[PDB]
Design a protein around this ligand. Structure first.
Ligand SMILES: CCCCCCCCCCCCCCC
Ligand SMILES: CCCCCCCCCCCCCCC
Ligand SMILES: [Cl-]
Ligand code: NA
Ligand code: NA
Length: 294
């Protein structure tokens, strides 16, 4: 029971490590197959695939009459994606954003502000329907702006992508399951700390996948994955949460998200997303996890 926990734990790590690299390589091949940019594939397939844990977590939590966890999980993931995830990736592989991707980042920013404003008094199911529809529009618009039998190159690509995604999702659950059975085995089992573990747990797909893409100098994909995941977390995870139950206002977190999104837009437009922008993102993330109410 103790090292069934550690067995699970290290195995989840192994699946995350290799699963994320396969997912990245498969996604990179699929992009070239579809004649779309790495950003596009990162912002659609990769973003949605890695945000599946948040969507299920938010749905489940709100269904179980815990809408605070539902929205806290969603927004906290967004902050993590810019602060920690993009922070680390930027230092590893600096990005200079093209004029086209800037436009996409600006639309991202507008979406976040809009979400922040309508969520001032919390999110109702109607807010959810709206965010979800904007989410769908964003996807179709992103694909279009980045676009234009059985070939073994394509078949191999899809298998890389899918086994890769299975690996990071299963690996993430093993990591979280593995860690929690360790904490139970050692009687350190708060769940003041448990909500911390699954929340960050849902973020592990984005983190490992982005780092993998960062190590392979695939900056567009990283940005796409960060941008799309945040939108999938609001327009998807948060939105679905609100369908089951009204979500309490998270104005402090939303404000933090707006500021980081805004910073992200400004760097993309007038400078670069590199070492010092990355260092700043991390600083802001570290300050956030130091002072936000748990
Ligand atoms: C995902 C497809 C659209 C789903 C829309 C779900 C709407 C849920 C409404 C719940 C009841 C609201 C009652 C208000 C009185
Ligand atoms: C990044 C800055 C985060 C500041 C958070 C203040 C939280 C107060 C509760
Ligand atoms: Cl790229
Ligand atoms: Na995601
Ligand atoms: Na995720």
């Amino acid at each position: 029971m103790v090292i069934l926990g550690v067995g699970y734990f290290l195995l989840g790590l192994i699946l995350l490590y290799y699963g994320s690299d396969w997912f990245v390589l498969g996604s990179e091949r699929i992009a070239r197959h579809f004649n779309v940019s790495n950003f596009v594939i990162g912002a659609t397939v990769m973003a949605i695939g890695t945000s599946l844990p948040e969507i299920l977590t938010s749905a489940y939590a709100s269904y179980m009459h815990a809408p605070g966890i539902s929205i806290g999980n969603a927004i906290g993931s967004c902050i993590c994606n810019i602060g920690l995830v993009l922070g680390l990736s930027a230092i590893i592989s600096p990005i200079i954003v093209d004029k086209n991707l800037q436009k996409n980042i600006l639309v991202y920013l507008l979406f976040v502000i809009f979400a922040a404003v309508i969520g001032i008094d919390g999110f109702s199911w109607i807010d959810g329907v709206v965010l979800l529809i904007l989410f769908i529009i964003y996807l179709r618009w992103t694909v279009k702006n980045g676009s234009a039998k059985n070939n073994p190159s394509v078949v191999f690509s899809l298998v890389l992508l899918i086994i890769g995604l299975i690996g990071v999702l299963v690996g993430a659950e093993l990591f979280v399951d593995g860690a929690k059975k360790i904490a139970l085995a050692l009687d350190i089992s708060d769940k003041v700390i448990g909500f911390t573990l699954v929340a960050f747990g849902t973020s592990l797909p984005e983190l490992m996948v982005s780092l993998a893409a960062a190590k392979r100098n695939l900056g567009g994909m990283v940005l796409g994955n960060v941008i799309g995941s945040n939108i999938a977390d609001i327009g998807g995870a948060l939105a679905v949460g609100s369908l089951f139950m009204h979500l309490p206002a998270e104005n402090v977190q939303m404000a933090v998200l707006v500021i980081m999104s805004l910073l992200l837009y400004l760097f993309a437009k007038y400078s670069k997303i590199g070492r010092w922008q990355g260092i700043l993102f991390l600083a802001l993330y570290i300050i956030a996890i130091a002072s936000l109410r748990m």
